[PDB]
């Protein structure tokens, strides 16, 4: 369908970048939207054809190019902290009604300082013996903490295979110190299984946190490890008890 790249991105304030959007559906109408909290989707620019660019209603301060029918480029020429949002691209063929085909979304974070970028700390909390006896069920709690920015994907893996049944993850990561503009974030997830599954000490439980941070093109001269895109995991083995 509609392909948009990057999917995650950290820019330093003043820096410039481009968002790419490719349609494999042969559509004439292309669109760039932004979406923040309190939202909703707000069109930045649009294009009706191969060589035409148009209107707001939030056009400052992005540029847009349409050179090919397939691609519609959003340029950030001077990145500002206000520009941190979720960008969404859309394609439409009319008159073919008229339904919008949305891209996967681009999450951008514009920071004054790149040293404020931190990957998460990961921890799994083992089920209570009391819950096991009271319900015959066992809840694992996973906590991802001290991370900046909010570019995180948490999955649970039991014995090397991704589990979906019994998992419940916060759709939104909490701000540890809310008044802070540069505040780190925390995220929680739960994995509930049967007591006898947890009791099997062969069963291996893992909470995987994929963090999206610094790019390969980011220069890092600091002594601390470069906060690059990485996976941080914490694991638990079944308890005989």
């Amino acid at each position: 369908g509609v392909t948009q790249t990057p999917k995650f991105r950290v820019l330093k304030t003043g820096q410039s970048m481009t968002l790419l959007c490719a349609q494999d559906m042969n559509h004439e109408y292309m669109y760039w939207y932004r979406q923040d909290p309190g939202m909703g989707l707000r069109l930045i620019h649009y294009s009706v054809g191969e060589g035409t660019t148009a209107k707001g209603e939030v056009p400052d301060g992005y540029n847009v190019s349409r050179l090919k029918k397939q691609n519609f480029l959003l340029g950030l020429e001077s990145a500002a902290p206000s520009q941190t949002s979720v960008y969404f691209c859309a394609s439409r063929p009319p008159l073919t009604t008229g339904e919008l085909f949305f891209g996967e979304g681009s999450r951008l974070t514009v920071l004054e300082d790149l040293k404020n970028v931190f990957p998460p700390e990961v921890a799994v909390f083992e089920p209570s013996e009391a819950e096991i006896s009271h319900t015959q069920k066992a809840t694992l709690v996973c906590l991802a903490t001290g991370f900046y920015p909010d570019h995180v994907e948490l999955s649970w893996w039991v014995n090397g295979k991704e589990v979906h049944s019994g998992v419940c993850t916060d759709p939104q990561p909490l701000k540890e110190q809310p008044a802070l503009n540069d505040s780190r974030y925390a995220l929680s997830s739960r994995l509930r299984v049967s007591a006898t599954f947890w009791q099997n000490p062969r069963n291996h439980f893992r909470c995987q946190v994929q963090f999206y941070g610094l790019s390969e093109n980011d220069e890092w001269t600091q002594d601390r490890a470069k906060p690059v895109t990485q996976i941080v995991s914490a694991e638990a083995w079944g308890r005989a008890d």
Binding site: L41, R42, K55, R92, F102, F125, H134, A234, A236
Partner: protein
């Protein structure tokens, strides 16, 4: 004046009927749309209305009143999977642009069959304990409020649908830096039932 959706929120129980109301004011109406947006995926098309009024389209109904600038999306036999944002949108100018409302976040509450609300203390897998409390198995009616203390973080209602045993459960997580903070005092700022199980040894 443009686009007004329920905002930011609506909450309902899985068996229920929900009506998502929308009002719009535009110069040249080329039709109204509704999209479903799961956090934080791309919105997906749900309905397009240009004529008055009601249209069934399965489990989701869509009404239009051109005279009033009013639309509603009706969701019947509500499911857990319907927990998403619902966006009201209008097509204006001469096609060319779809303008969106702010969006309505719909939280579906799970109909708990046999509830036993309890606060369980989960110790850390590695070392130091760092202390987490879990308030689980409580009914839909129960509302988990944020703490009076800054140093204690609370993650509001979560439903774990264990497909295997045809079960789904409510939960909330509470953790705080080694003060010490306790499981008995974790959910003090919330409206929790009198029968809540409290184990500690």
């Amino acid at each position: 004046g443009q686009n007004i959706d329920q905002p930011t929120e609506m909450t309902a129980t899985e068996g229920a009927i929900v009506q998502i109301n929308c009002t719009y004011q535009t110069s040249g109406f080329n039709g109204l749309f509704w999209y479903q947006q799961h956090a934080g995926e791309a919105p997906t098309f749900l309905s397009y209305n240009v004529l008055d009024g009601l249209e069934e389209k399965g489990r989701f109904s869509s009404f239009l009143s051109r005279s009033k600038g009013y639309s509603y999306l009706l969701l019947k036999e509500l499911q857990m999977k319907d927990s998403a944002s619902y966006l009201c949108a209008v097509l204006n100018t001469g096609g060319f642009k779809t303008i969106f409302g702010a969006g309505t976040r719909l939280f579906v509450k799970a109909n708990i069959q046999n509830p036993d609300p309890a606060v369980y203390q989960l110790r850390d897998s590695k070392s130091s304990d760092k202390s987490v409390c879990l308030f689980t198995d409580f009914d839909s009616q129960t509302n988990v409020s944020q703490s009076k203390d800054s140093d204690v973080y609370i993650t509001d209602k979560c439903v774990l649908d264990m497909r295997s045993m045809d079960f789904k459960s409510n939960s909330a997580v509470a953790w705080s830096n080694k003060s010490d903070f306790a499981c008995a005092n974790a959910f003090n700022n919330s409206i929790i039932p009198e029968d809540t199980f409290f184990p500690s040894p």
